[PDB]
Design a protein around this ligand. Structure first.
Ligand code: MG
Ligand code: MG
Ligand code: MG
Ligand code: MG
Ligand code: MG
Ligand code: MG
Ligand code: MG
Ligand code: MG
Ligand code: MG
Ligand code: MG
Ligand code: MG
Ligand code: MG
Ligand code: MG
Ligand code: MG
Ligand code: MG
Ligand code: MG
Ligand code: MG
Ligand code: MG
Ligand code: MG
Ligand code: MG
Ligand code: MG
Ligand code: MG
Ligand code: MG
Ligand code: MG
Ligand code: MG
Ligand code: MG
Ligand code: MG
Ligand code: MG
Ligand code: MG
Ligand code: MG
Ligand code: MG
Ligand code: MG
Ligand code: MG
Ligand code: MG
Ligand code: MG
Ligand code: MG
Ligand code: MG
Ligand code: MG
Ligand code: MG
Ligand code: MG
Ligand code: MG
Ligand code: MG
Ligand code: MG
Ligand code: MG
Ligand code: MG
Ligand code: MG
Ligand code: MG
Lengths: 113, 134, 109, 205, 57
RNA sequence: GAUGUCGGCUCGUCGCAUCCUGGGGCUGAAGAAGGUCCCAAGGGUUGGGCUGUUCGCCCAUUAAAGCGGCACGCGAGCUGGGUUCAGAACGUCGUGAGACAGUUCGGUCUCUAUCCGCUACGGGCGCAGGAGAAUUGAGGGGAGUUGCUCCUAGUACGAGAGGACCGGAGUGAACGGACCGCUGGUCUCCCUGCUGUCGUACCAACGGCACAUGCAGGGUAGCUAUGUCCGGAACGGAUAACCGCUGAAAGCAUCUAAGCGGGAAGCCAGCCCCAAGAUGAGUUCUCCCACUGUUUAUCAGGUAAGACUCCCGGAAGACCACCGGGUUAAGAGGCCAGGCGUGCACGCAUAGCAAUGUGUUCAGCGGACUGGUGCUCAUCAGUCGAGGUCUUGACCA
RNA sequence: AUUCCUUGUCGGGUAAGUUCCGACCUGCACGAAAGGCGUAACGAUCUGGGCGCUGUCUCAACGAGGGACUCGGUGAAAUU
RNA sequence: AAGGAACUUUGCAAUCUCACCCCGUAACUUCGGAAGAAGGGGUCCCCACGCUUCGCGUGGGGCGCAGUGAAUAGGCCCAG
C-alpha cells in the first residue's frame, strides 16, 4: 500500500488550513503544545517551509507568503530564523511526548526548533 | 472489444451504411469456408474476429438492405491493439466489412485502413481491397 | 521483506538499459515521421506513420511516444516504444508551438 | 529438486528478437549450505540454505551456534528444498539455463479483510433498482429449515492475500550470472522487494 | 428484521466475556532527576527532565 | 398469543431417471454422420425480443444450451412486477348497500445478532526444563470445462460423391490465480489554465470561497481490468460397463464357479494451498544451565539463554497479529543528488497605444519513487523468563 | 380501462414483439346525457416506440467525505 | 477504457440538456395556439470607429482545451 500522509478526520481544505496555522505558530513561537499526531503532521511541512525560506530571493518569500499568511511571521522566518539555520541540513524540528489529559484522554506533545 | 449492441460503421460498397452487432462467434476461416465457434461465450469482438450483425442503415440503392442481418468482420476497434513489439494502434471510429460464408466481402472494396491482423488471420481479399494496411 | 541493501533502481537500469535507445529531440506538437518496418512472411516491407506527436510517456526501456494521423478520412493514432526493433528511424519535420504536454484535446480536429 | 532463493526486484519491458517480453527481475544472491538433511539423520530428504545476510550483532545465540556448525555467517532468512544435493554453496548459474521453465513461489501482496467481490468474485446487487442497503452483500447463505445450518467453507468476507502463491512454468529469459540476477518471463506474486523461491517446474508437459 | 437475544445470558458466560477487559498496568520507571516517576520515552512530569529540562517544574 | 406466498436478483449445494464431455454393447453400423441401450455425476450448460411471469414461442449462437431436490432452497438477503387492504373506472351480477381467482390505474417491505452455524483474526493454557529457528504430513480444502485448425491422409472405407479411427502438433473461448512492465482507469491539492468575489493597504504576486477538489487540463507511486503471465495435464495403481486368457461342473462348448490380463472426463495417488489442539500433541539443528532462600517458610526469588515492554516506521493489518529499525545505529522524516510529473516561475529586460508576445527559462514548482547523507526523533531504562515427576528397560563407570 | 375462448387473424415496428399501433367483427358481456363518437390545447395521469446522454448494465475500478473499527468521557433498547 | 438500455417489472436512478442574444421551426388547429416545437450559430480580453447612455453594433487584433469559463440554469421527439 505505498500511500503517504494523514487524513486527520478533516476534509482536505481543512487539512491545509490547519498545517498552515500550525506552521504559522511553530514559526511564531519556537515550540507548541499539541496532539502527538498533529505534531508528526506538522514536522516535515514546517521543515520543507524552512527550506523554501532558506534562499533569500524574492521568490522564496512569495513561496512562503502563500502558506504562512502573516507578514510579521513570514518576515521572521525569512530574515530572522532561516538564515540562522544556514549550516544545518535538516532537522529544524524535534518532538517530545508529554502525557495524557482529562476529556479526550489523548497522548500530547511539544514540537520545537 | 465489440459486443452485442455495438453500432459499428461499414468499410464497404455493399450498401450497408450502419450495422449493429448481435452475436460474436469465434470461427477462424479455414479449410472449406468459415468455421464454427470456439464456443458459446467470447463476450467481445476485436479486429478480425467475426461478429454476426443486424443491419441498421443502408444506401437507397445497393446490394444489401435496411434489416438484412448478415455476418461482418471487424476492421476498426476504437479500442486498442497491442502487437508483439509494444506497438499499439487505435482508430477514432469503430468499423467493419460485411461478408459471405467463405469469407470475402459483399463489397467491391474497402474504405479507410485495416489492421495488419486481418492479414494474420488470412482475410486475403479484404486486406487487398484495403486502401491502407497499417 | 528480505531486507537487503541494494539499489532497486540500479539493477533495474542494469537490465533495462541494454534494451534502451534515444531519439531526436521531439517535444509534443512537433509533427514527425517514423520510418517503421513490417515483416510480411519471410519478407520485410516498410511503412511510415507521419503525424502530430501527442504524448511521450515513461522512461528507460519503457519510454514511448504516441503519434496521431488522419489516414483516409478515418482518424488513427499509434504508439511506439522508443526501442522496438520494428521502428527504424524518427525524424522531426515540424516543431509545434504547444502549450500543454499531452495533446488529447486535438481529438476534435 | 532444482531450487534457490532470492528477492523480487522489479517488473520491466525488454526485447528478445522482436517481441516485447515483459520480465520480472529476481535476484538470487549466493545461498550457503547451512543444513544437509538425509534419511538416517532426519528421516526425510532435503537441504536447508539461506538468503539475505545479517551482522553477527543482531543475531541470537542459538542461531549463531547453528550458522557456525558449518562456518557460514548468518543469513537473515532460512529455508528448505526437498531432494537436492549440491557441493560447495549455491547460486543460479549451475542451476538454471536460459529458457528452462520454472515454478516461482512467493507470498502475495495481502489486502486486509476483503469484500465478497474482491475476495471471491461475487455478482453484486442492482446498484439502482430500489435496492436498499444491498449494493455489496452476497445475498443468501443457505436454504432453510433443511439443513438449517450454513455450509462449511462457504466463501464470504475475509482477509484476502498474504497467501503463499506458486505460479507454474515460467521461462528463464536471461541469466546475468555473477551479478546473481535472474530475468523471468512475466508475473511473480507478492510485492516488490519480495522474497521468492525459484524451483524447477513441478511438472513436465 | 430486529434481532434481539433469545434467552437472558448467565452470570457464567457473561463473566467469561469480561475475561479480557482487564486493564494493563502502566509499566513505569523512576526519573533520574526530580524523582517522581516517568513513562518511557516521555517527560518526567515533576521537574521537566528529558535529559536537561523542558516543560517547567 | 402468526411457519410471510408467485417471479425476478444474490448466493449456493445435492439427486441421476445424463443435455454436453469421457468409456462400451447393439445396429436396418461401409465412411462420414446417426439410432438405441449399458457404465459414468469430474467439470461444464450462452446472450437477447415479448409477457409479473415460472413456462412457452421466436432472434443468434453452442460440445451442450439436461431434469429435479433442498419450507414449489434462498425477504432478520434485496427487489415488490404477479396476487391480498382501504381510492377510482370499466364490463357483468344486484331493486339496493355491495359484488367476481374478470380487467385496469395507485398503493409504507420494520438502522443494533444473545446462542448454534459461517468467514476471518487474537488472548489462554496445554503439549514433563527454559528458549531461537528449520520441518515430516495424519488428515483437510481448491482444482478437474471445451471448441477450431493442422499433420498423420485425400491414406483405411466407399463405383462414386465423400471421407476416417488411433496417434501427434498447434491456436482459442469461459473460468481461475497472480501481477502492474505494456495498454488504459483513477490518482480530493503533484503541476498548470480559468472565472465571479472577498482579503494580504495599493500595482504586481498570492490566499480563501464557489464539494463535502469551485471548473477545466494533464497526472507519478499505489489500487485496479478491458491489460499481462500462468493453469486444468502427463504418468502410475485399483475399478464400472465391457473385452478376453487358462477352464471344470455339463468328455463338447463356456471370461467364472478357484485363479489371471485389459478397461473411463469417474476412485485412490500424482498438482496448488492449510496442516502436530494429529491431547496419538511427532522429528532435527542450536543455545542457557545444574543458582539462592533456618520444611519456626516442601515452594517461591534473583538470574542465564532468550523475550516482552516502549519509541520509530512498513509494499503486514479494523483492534490484536506480522515484518524491519531502535546510536555498535541509515529505521522513518528532513536534507542533497537523481527519477518522474506538470510545461516555461518571480523578477527584470525587450516588442508593442493596449490585449499580449519574446528573452532571461529543457525554466519554476513537487504527494508516495530511487539511492546517499548523522540535521531530527528512535533517550533512559521497567517487566518477565530455566533448575527439569515417577516407572520399568537397555547401555557406561 | 369493457374480450371468456387468447399470445384471435392479418399488417407495421424488431434480428426476434403475450406488449403497442391499423384493420378485421364470431361485441362470452359497447351504444347514445348512469350520455355515443370525436377533438385543438392542457397533464408531477396512464401506454408503446424513437434520438440524444449515461456505470442502469457487460463488470466493475480508483478516489473522496460521513459511519463502521481503536482509545479516554456519559452509556440506552426491544428480548429473556 | 471499449460498448451505450445489452439493465429491467419501466431508462427506477443518474448523466444529457441549461441563461441571454441572432437564424430558423412540423403535422394539427377551436386561429388563441402547439412553440422555448425541432435545428443551428454567437458569448471572453484589447485597440480604433459609429450609435441614445452604465450601454451596444461594426472592424482588426490577442490568449486558453474550452470565454452564461465558477455557481444559480429546459433533454427532445412520434404515436395511443
Ligand atoms: Mg471521530
Ligand atoms: Mg472546499
Ligand atoms: Mg484479449
Ligand atoms: Mg425494413
Ligand atoms: Mg498515461
Ligand atoms: Mg497491506
Ligand atoms: Mg454491480
Ligand atoms: Mg440439523
Ligand atoms: Mg415469529
Ligand atoms: Mg447410471
Ligand atoms: Mg452438476
Ligand atoms: Mg408443493
Ligand atoms: Mg419459495
Ligand atoms: Mg427467512
Ligand atoms: Mg405488486
Ligand atoms: Mg343493474
Ligand atoms: Mg457474535
Ligand atoms: Mg493427506
Ligand atoms: Mg481432526
Ligand atoms: Mg475437494
Ligand atoms: Mg496435405
Ligand atoms: Mg476426392
Ligand atoms: Mg483473466
Ligand atoms: Mg510504474
Ligand atoms: Mg499507470
Ligand atoms: Mg497601511
Ligand atoms: Mg492584482
Ligand atoms: Mg473567506
Ligand atoms: Mg462564506
Ligand atoms: Mg463550503
Ligand atoms: Mg482533475
Ligand atoms: Mg490397468
Ligand atoms: Mg528533486
Ligand atoms: Mg505546496
Ligand atoms: Mg528515502
Ligand atoms: Mg405480429
Ligand atoms: Mg363520460
Ligand atoms: Mg393540474
Ligand atoms: Mg425496447
Ligand atoms: Mg468508548
Ligand atoms: Mg469514451
Ligand atoms: Mg429518471
Ligand atoms: Mg402560426
Ligand atoms: Mg430553442
Ligand atoms: Mg488556440
Ligand atoms: Mg470562439
Ligand atoms: Mg436541472
Amino acid at each position: 500500500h505505498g500511500k503517504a500522509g494523514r487524513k486527520l478526520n478533516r476534509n482536505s481544505s481543512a487539512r491545509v488550513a490547519l498545517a498552515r496555522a500550525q506552521a504559522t505558530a511553530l514559526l511564531r513561537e519556537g515550540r507548541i503544545q499539541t496532539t502527538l499526531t498533529k505534531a508528526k503532521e506538522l514536522r516535515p511541512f514546517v521543515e520543507q517551509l524552512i527550506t523554501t525560506a532558506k534562499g533569500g530571493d524574492l521568490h522564496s518569500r512569495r513561496l512562503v507568503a502563500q502558506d504562512i499568511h502573516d507578514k510579521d511571521v513570514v518576515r521572521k522566518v525569512m530574515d530572522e530564523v532561516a538564515p540562522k539555520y544556514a549550516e544545518r541540513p535538516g532537522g529544524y524540528t524535534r518532538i517530545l511526548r508529554v502525557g495524557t489529559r482529562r476529556g479526550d484522554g489523548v497522548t500530547m506533545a511539544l514540537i520545537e526548533l | 472489444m465489440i459486443m452485442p449492441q455495438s453500432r459499428l460503421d461499414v468499410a464497404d460498397n455493399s450498401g450497408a451504411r450502419e450495422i449493429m452487432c448481435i452475436r460474436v462467434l469465434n470461427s477462424g476461416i479455414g479449410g472449406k469456408g468459415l468455421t464454427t465457434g470456439g464456443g458459446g461465450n467470447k463476450r467481445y469482438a476485436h479486429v478480425g474476429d467475426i461478429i454476426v450483425a443486424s443491419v441498421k442503415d443502408a444506401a437507397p440503392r445497393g446490394a444489401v438492405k435496411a434489416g438484412d442481418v448478415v455476418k461482418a468482420v471487424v476492421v476498426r476497434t476504437s479500442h486498442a491493439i497491442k502487437r508483439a513489439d509494444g506497438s499499439t494502434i487505435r482508430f477514432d471510429r469503430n468499423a467493419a466489412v460485411i461478408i459471405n460464408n467463405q469469407g470475402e466481402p459483399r463489397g467491391t472494396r474497402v474504405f479507410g485502413p485495416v489492421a495488419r491482423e486481418l492479414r494474420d488471420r488470412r482475410f486475403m481479399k479484404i486486406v487487398s481491397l484495403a486502401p491502407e494496411v497499417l | 521483506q528480505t531486507h537487503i541493501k541494494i539499489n532497486r533502481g540500479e539493477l533495474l537500469r542494469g537490465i533495462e538499459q541494454d534494451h534502451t535507445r534515444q531519439l531526436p529531440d521531439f517535444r509534443p506538437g512537433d509533427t514527425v515521421r517514423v520510418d517503421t518496418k513490417v515483416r510480411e512472411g519471410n519478407r520485410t516491407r516498410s511503412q511510415a506513420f507521419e503525424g502530430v506527436v501527442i504524448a511521450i510517456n515513461g522512461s528507460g526501456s519503457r519510454k514511448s511516444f504516441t503519434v496521431r494521423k488522419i489516414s483516409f478520412g478515418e482518424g488513427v493514432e499509434r504508439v511506439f516504444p522508443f526501442a522496438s526493433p520494428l521502428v527504424n528511424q524518427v525524424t522531426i519535420v515540424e516543431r509545434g508551438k504547444v502549450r500543454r504536454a499531452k495533446l488529447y484535446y486535438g481529438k476534435a480536429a | 529438486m532444482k531450487g534457490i532463493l532470492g528477492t523480487k526486484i522489479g517488473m520491466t519491458q525488454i526485447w528478445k528478437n522482436d517481441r516485447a517480453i515483459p520480465v520480472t527481475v529476481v535476484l538470487a544472491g549466493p545461498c550457503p549450505i547451512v543444513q544437509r538433511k538425509t534419511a538416517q539423520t532426519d528421516g526425510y530428504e532435503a537441504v536447508q540454505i539461506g538468503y539475505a545476510p545479517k551482522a553477527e550483532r543482531k543475531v541470537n545465540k542459538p542461531m549463531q551456534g547453528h550458522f557456525a556448525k558449518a562456518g557460514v555467517a548468518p543469513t537473515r532468512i532460512l529455508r528448505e528444498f526437498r531432494g537436492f544435493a549440491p557441493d560447495g554453496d549455491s547460486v543460479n548459474v549451475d542451476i538454471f539455463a536460459e529458457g528452462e521453465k520454472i515454478d516461482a513461489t512467493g507470498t502475495s501482496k495481502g489486502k486486509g479483510t476483503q469484500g465478497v467481490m474482491k475476495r471471491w468474485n461475487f455478482a453484486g446487487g442492482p446498484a439502482s433498482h430500489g435496492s436498499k442497503k444491498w449494493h455489496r452483500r452476497p445475498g443468501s447463505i443457505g436454504q432453510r429449515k433443511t439443513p438449517g445450518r450454513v455450509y462449511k467453507g462457504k466463501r464470504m468476507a475475509g482477509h484476502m492475500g498474504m497467501e503463499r502463491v506458486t505460479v507454474q512454468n515460467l521461462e528463464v529469459v536471461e541469466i546475468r550470472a555473477g551479478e546473481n540476477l535472474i530475468l523471468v518471463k512475466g508475473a511473480i506474486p507478492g510485492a516488490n522487494g519480495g522474497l521468492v523461491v525459484l524451483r524447477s517446474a513441478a511438472k513436465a508437459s | 428484521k430486529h434481532p434481539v437475544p433469545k434467552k437472558k445470558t448467565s452470570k457464567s458466560k457473561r463473566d467469561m466475556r469480561r475475561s479480557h477487559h482487564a486493564l494493563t498496568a502502566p509499566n513505569l520507571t523512576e526519573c533520574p532527576q526530580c524523582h517522581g516517576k516517568k513513562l518511557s520515552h516521555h517527560i518526567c512530569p515533576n521537574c521537566g527532565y528529558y535529559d536537561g529540562r523542558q516543560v517547567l517544574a
